[PDB]
Amino acid sequence: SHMVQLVNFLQSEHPQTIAVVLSYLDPPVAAQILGALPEELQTEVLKRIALLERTSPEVVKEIERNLEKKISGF
Amino acid sequence: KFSKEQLRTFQMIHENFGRALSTYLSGRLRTFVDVEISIDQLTYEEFIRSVMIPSFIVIFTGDVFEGSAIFEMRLDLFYTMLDIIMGGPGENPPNRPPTEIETSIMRKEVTNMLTLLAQAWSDFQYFIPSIENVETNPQFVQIVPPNEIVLLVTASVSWGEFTSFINVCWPFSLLEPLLEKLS
Numbered sequence: 165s166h167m168v169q170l171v172n173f174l175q176s177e178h179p180q181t182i183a184v185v186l187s188y189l190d191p192p193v194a195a196q197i198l199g200a201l202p203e204e205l206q207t208e209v210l211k212r213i214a215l216l217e218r219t220s221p222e223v224v225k226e227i228e229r230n231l232e233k234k235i236s237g238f
Numbered sequence: 239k240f241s242k243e244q245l246r247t248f249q250m251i252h253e254n255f256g257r258a259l260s261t262y263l264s265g266r267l268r269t270f271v272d273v274e275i276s277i278d279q280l281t282y283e284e285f286i287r288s289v290m291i292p293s294f295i296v297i298f299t300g301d302v303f304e305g306s307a308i309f310e311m312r313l314d315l316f317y318t319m320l321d322i323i324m325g326g327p328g329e330n331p332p333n334r335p336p337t338e339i340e341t342s343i344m345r346k347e348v349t350n351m352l353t354l355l356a357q358a359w360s361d362f363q364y365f366i367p368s369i370e371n372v373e374t375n376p377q378f379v380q381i382v383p384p385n386e387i388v389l390l391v392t393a394s395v396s397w398g399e400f401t402s403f404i405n406v407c408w409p410f411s412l413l414e415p416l417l418e419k420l421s
């Protein structure tokens with residue numbers, strides 16, 4: 165249930181939003197999700213995970229609070 | 239409606255806000271941005287149509303404010319920012335209603351942004367702006383009677399080649415408690 169719900173979640177999100185989320189989770193869980201994204205997002209997210217030059221400390225745990233939201237186990 | 243002298247004072251109340259908006263987002267777009275303000279008088283329907291569907295619409299008020307004002311941001315600019323603050327280049331802006339995350343991030347931004355407006359108004363009326371409600375559809379808002387005249391603030395945001403609009407809506411119910419005028 166932790167897998168399926170995260171996917172429904174990121175399918176809607178921005179290619180840059182989806183990117184950052186998969187970079188904080190370990191690559192296993194992340195790519196397990198990256199395998200449930202469509203054709204375009206699989207590539208569009210992936211090439212943007214390449215260009216994660218620097219991330220913002222406030223925006224991440226603001227996503228961690230948009231996490232803790234609607235999936236049971238974190 | 240308004241006077242010939244009231245339109246002039248209102249140009250110097252979106253003064254600083256023109257320049258403060260300028261150096262604020264440029265500080266968060268990590269590049270130079272120029273901003274220009276054009277002011278006008280419109281009916282409340284002349285404005286509610288000139289907002290594309292959908293769009294990012296924030297309605298707000300103040301402590302000393304009896305009423306409600308609109309903070310409008312076109313969607314092309316909206317997603318352009320969301321990208322930059324999440325390690326992006328400035329993508330192609332998808333024209334869709336935003337998700338939970340994407341507003342929660344930007345509400346904090348339109349909050350810090352709206353405060354800048356209030357820092358130009360501290361000369362005439364001090365107020366802490368708190369956002370009442372958020373909406374994405376302009377045919378769903380309609381705060382005051384559809385034909386009540388409005389102070390419309392058009393902020394021309396532009397950089398590089400791209401260009402967009404920030405709009406703030408002051409409807410005649412207004413500072414009519416403060417139209418026993420400041421000056």
